[PDB]
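Standup notes
- HV: blocked on the assembly model, inputs below
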Amino acid sequence: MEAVRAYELQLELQQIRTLRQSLELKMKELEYAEGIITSLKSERRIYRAFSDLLVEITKDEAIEHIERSRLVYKREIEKLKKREKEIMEELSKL
Amino acid sequence: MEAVRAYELQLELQQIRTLRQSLELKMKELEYAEGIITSLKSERRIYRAFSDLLVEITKDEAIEHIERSRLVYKREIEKLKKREKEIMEELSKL
Amino acid sequence: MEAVRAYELQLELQQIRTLRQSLELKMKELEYAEGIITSLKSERRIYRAFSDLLVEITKDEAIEHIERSRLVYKREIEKLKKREKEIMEELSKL
Amino acid sequence: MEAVRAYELQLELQQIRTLRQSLELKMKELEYAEGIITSLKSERRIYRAFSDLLVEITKDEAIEHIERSRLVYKREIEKLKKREKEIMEELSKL
Ligand SMILES: [Cl-]
């Protein structure tokens, strides 16, 4: 019945939204970090986490990481939002 | 049957409690950190985590973060506890 | 039927084991850290994590934290292992 | 029916794949860290995470940890991939 087709579209939508929201959080945290790293205070040490190690990196390396990561996240988020878009439309047609 | 209505209220209550407890933990960890940061020892470096980066911050920045975060958590916790309150009352009326 | 009573005891046992194993992991990680902190190398900075902040602590503070945490974990682990013990015995009697 | 036997093989395969992928991620993160640690920049502080403590370690200690961890992960990954191999073959024979 339509109720079942809708529930399954809703289940898919929730899973996509959950993945998408996790990526936006990480993306926003890195943008916040970029604002601090590029602020006026002269010295701020920065570390990058790799599994269970924290390795010191430079301001330039940190900015590079933030910019590349944002690109990967923006792309993944755009793709997921377009899938959410399609599903919301199907749900609307029902 | 009442058993089913109760089970569904119980399911909702557990999910709210789980979210609430996660927030109280983070809130209490930051209050503990504040006590240390404002203690007598002269020098303690502090870092703030943003996704996979750790960025050095000052004592004043750390205290600001702790106070703002506590406000956000206290508010979210109060709202969830009020929802738990309502549900516990419904469960009692049944 | 006995199969159902056994499945439910098995479900409970798995959940207890999962909680217990998580605590033993954290406990063992802190014991490993203690071995390093008390080793010969003269200077090793140490930080303690509180939610999203890392705060510098001394060797003595780190050892204190490790010892107290081990006590809390050992106690929680002993209590869970005794519950696992009871269940395994019930499963055996069936 | 074959559909049910296949679903159960698929369920097992997904769980194995999920464990395997988690290990490959950690393994790749440590290999990335090794590349940075052994790069030209003269001074980079390194910390290792043990539960809620971060303890400073040397470049040599970090490399040792990365190499041992890779061995443990490579072995666990090879064993899981061989189990995935078997299941994919069963699924093919059905
Ligand atoms: Cl440092």
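- HV (later): unblocked. The first strand of chain D starts at residue 46 and ends at 50. Chain D has one domain: 1-94.
- Next: hand off to the docking folks.
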